[PDB]
Amino acid sequence: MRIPLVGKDSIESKDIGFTLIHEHLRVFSEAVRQQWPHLYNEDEEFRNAVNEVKRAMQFGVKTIVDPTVMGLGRDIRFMEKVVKATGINLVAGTGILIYIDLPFYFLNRSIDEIADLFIHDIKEGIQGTLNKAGFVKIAADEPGITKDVEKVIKAAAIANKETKVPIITHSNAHNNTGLEQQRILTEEGVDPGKILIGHLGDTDNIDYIKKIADKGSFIGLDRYGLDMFLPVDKRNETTLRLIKDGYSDKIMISHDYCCTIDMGTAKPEYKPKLAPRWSTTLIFEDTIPFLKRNGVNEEVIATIFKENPKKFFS
Amino acid sequence: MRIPLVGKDSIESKDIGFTLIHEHLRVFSEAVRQQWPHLYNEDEEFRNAVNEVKRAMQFGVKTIVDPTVMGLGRDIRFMEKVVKATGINLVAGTGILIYIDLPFYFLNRSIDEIADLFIHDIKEGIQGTLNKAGFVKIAADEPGITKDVEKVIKAAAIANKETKVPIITHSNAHNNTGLEQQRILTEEGVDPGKILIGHLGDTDNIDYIKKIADKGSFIGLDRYGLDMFLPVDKRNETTLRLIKDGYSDKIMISHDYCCTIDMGTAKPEYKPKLAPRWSTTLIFEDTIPFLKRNGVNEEVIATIFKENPKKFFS
Ligand SMILES: [Co+2]
Numbered sequence: 001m002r003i004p005l006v007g008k009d010s011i012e013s014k015d016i017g018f019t020l021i022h023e024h025l026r027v028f029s030e031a032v033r034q035q036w037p038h039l040y041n042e043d044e045e046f047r048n049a050v051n052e053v054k055r056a057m058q059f060g061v062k063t064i065v066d067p068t069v070m071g072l073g074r075d076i077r078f079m080e081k082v083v084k085a086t087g088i089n090l091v092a093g094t095g096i097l098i099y100i101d102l103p104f105y106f107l108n109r110s111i112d113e114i115a116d117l118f119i120h121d122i123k124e125g126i127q128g129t130l131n132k133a134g135f136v137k138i139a140a141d142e143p144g145i146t147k148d149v150e151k152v153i154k155a156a157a158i159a160n161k162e163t164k165v166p167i168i169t170h171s172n173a174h175n176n177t178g179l180e181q182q183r184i185l186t187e188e189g190v191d192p193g194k195i196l197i198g199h200l201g202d203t204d205n206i207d208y209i210k211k212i213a214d215k216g217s218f219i220g221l222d223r224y225g226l227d228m229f230l231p232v233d234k235r236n237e238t239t240l241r242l243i244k245d246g247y248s249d250k251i252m253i254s255h256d257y258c259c260t261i262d263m264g265t266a267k268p269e270y271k272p273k274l275a276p277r278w279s280t281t282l283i284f285e286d287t288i289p290f291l292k293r294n295g296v297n298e299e300v301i302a303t304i305f306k307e308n309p310k311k312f313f314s
Numbered sequence: 315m316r317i318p319l320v321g322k323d324s325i326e327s328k329d330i331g332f333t334l335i336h337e338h339l340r341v342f343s344e345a346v347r348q349q350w351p352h353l354y355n356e357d358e359e360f361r362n363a364v365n366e367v368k369r370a371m372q373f374g375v376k377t378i379v380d381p382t383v384m385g386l387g388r389d390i391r392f393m394e395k396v397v398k399a400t401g402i403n404l405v406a407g408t409g410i411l412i413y414i415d416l417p418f419y420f421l422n423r424s425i426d427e428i429a430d431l432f433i434h435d436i437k438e439g440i441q442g443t444l445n446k447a448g449f450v451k452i453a454a455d456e457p458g459i460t461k462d463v464e465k466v467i468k469a470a471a472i473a474n475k476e477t478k479v480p481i482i483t484h485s486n487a488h489n490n491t492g493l494e495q496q497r498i499l500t501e502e503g504v505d506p507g508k509i510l511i512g513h514l515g516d517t518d519n520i521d522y523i524k525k526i527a528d529k530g531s532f533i534g535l536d537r538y539g540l541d542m543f544l545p546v547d548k549r550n551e552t553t554l555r556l557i558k559d560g561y562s563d564k565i566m567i568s569h570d571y572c573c574t575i576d577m578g579t580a581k582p583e584y585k586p587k588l589a590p591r592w593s594t595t596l597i598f599e600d601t602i603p604f605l606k607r608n609g610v611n612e613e614v615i616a617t618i619f620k621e622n623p624k625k626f627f628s
Pocket residue numbers: 169170171198199
């Protein structure tokens with residue numbers, strides 16, 4: 001297939017190259033930014049995103065997939081400015097990130113109406129531009145598969161069947177929300193190989209992770225650097241074990257890094273070892289060197305960062 | 315006190331004149347408008363608001379209080395354009411309308427931080443303008459007094475104690491959310507006479523309505539025309555009974571009219587009598603004529619629409 005890119009002509013999926021599948025140029029709550037602009041500094045957000053993207057490119061990253069959608073402050077014009085300043089291939093998406101209920105707008109509205117919003121972004125363009133969405137992003141977390149969460153999942157299935165774009169999820173690794181997302185999507189006719197079940201790297205429960213991979217979907221070991229969810233060393237051991245056991249062709253690795261994010265800062269926790277620097281390049285500083293010196297060869301690295309994204313977007 | 319007005323110098327509260335205490339120039343879900351602008355037409359929204367405001371002014375309305383805040387799409391620049399086009403006195407507010415949880419921005423943030431946002435809008439101005447907020451708006455509905463709902467209530471109390479602006483609420487008339495809002499605010503030191511408990515006209519449970527008025531707060535008979543909550547005739551009978559029983563000095567009347575609103579349309583219900591035309595002038599067409607021909611004198615009308623707002627803002 002051809003993948004739409006922000007600020008560029010679309011590319012063939014075979015040309016995606018080395019990809020970070022889950023990173024955020026910027027995240028914010030739409031209602032807070034609209035109501036209290038004094039809390040934000042767009043110039044700093046722009047500088048932060050440009051600098052992070054440039055650093056990723058210096059390590060060989062060719063494409064970044066950014067699943068900032070409704071609920072996380074997607075801004076296609078900000079994204080296109082970052083592209084112009086860096087030259088990155090940037091894949092933007094459509095979708096909705098909620099944990100409980102949809103915004104009031106959606107009262108009395110059908111799953112088809114929700115799907116039409118996603119299809120609009122895929123076929124016509126995002127936010128009044130010709131930049132088109134290349135995937136759909138959906139979520140579930142601690143509250144489980146609520147009524148409105150299910151509506152969004154089913155709308156993503158409709159958009160995938162109509163346009164063939166893949167689906168990226170946010171899940172909570174400690175309930176079975178990821179497993180439920182996969183099942184609900186596949187029951188609607190979505191190819192399991194067109195789904196990335198997100199945030200599975202937040203657990204060391206390898207049997208749960210493997211169960212989802214064995215059902216055909218990519219597994220998101222996608223929060224490297226967020227020690228609050230799982231420390232880097234345990235993520236590395238889980239990643240290494242999955243590679244040793246033959247799961248390279250389902251593994252996707254990223255950081256979920258937010259070059260800026262507006263949420264309040266949680267209480268710091270200090271451990272014996274110096275805290276890792278969460279960024280878009282931590283895997284080049286820590287994870288990839290760790291895998292290599294544990295015997296993981298170059299072909300595994302190419303599978304995870306090139307072949308798997310290529311398949312996902314094919 | 316002096317009441318700040320959008321696009322005008324502040325006025326003494328004695329000069330507020332005939333007031334509609336709860337009307338919306340425009341409502342939308344911030345995240346949906348940001349992500350799917352194709353669903354909206356600002357020129358139509360502007361025309362609708364200007365035309366409604368002009369009609370209200372033709373019946374003698376001097377001031378409109380608009381409690382559109384975070385969660386309902388407050389836009390101070392849109393409001394100031396409507397003022398420029400009409401000459402209305404418009405009171406804008408600050409606050410947050412949620413039913414369950416706050417946006418992700420508020421994770422790990424204190425009640426004091428929330429109050430600081432409201433105080434910023436009151437003292438410094440709304441959305442980067444010098445238009446200042448003249449009241450705080452808070453909500454609770456079917457989910458009851460959740461953790462985050464309580465946080466917003468307590469933040470409104472802090473803002474009221476610091477700045478002396480009054481508090482308008484949204485409640486669900488069929489639970490005791492309005493009674494709970496009143497109690498929580500008064501326990502924090504808010505004068506009950508600085509509170510309007512909203513949406514009480516949605517019930518004909520006169521004992522519940524009177525209980526709140528007797529605890530010192532204004533009662534919002536504030537959704538005239540929304541037959542889905544309560545039909546006009548039963549609202550009129552409840553209003554008349556409250557007047558007959560001596561409650562004029564606590565009654566506030568409005569329509570909650572939204573000149574535009576983005577929410578999906580509920581299923582229509584057709585009754586034997588022609589449905590009333592919900593607008594900002596329905597009370598001049600129906601309610602006020604009904605009260606007068608049932609013996610309600612001009613002094614009652616002046617109490618409800620002039621003296622009560624004056625007290626509320628004093
Ligand atoms: Co996520």
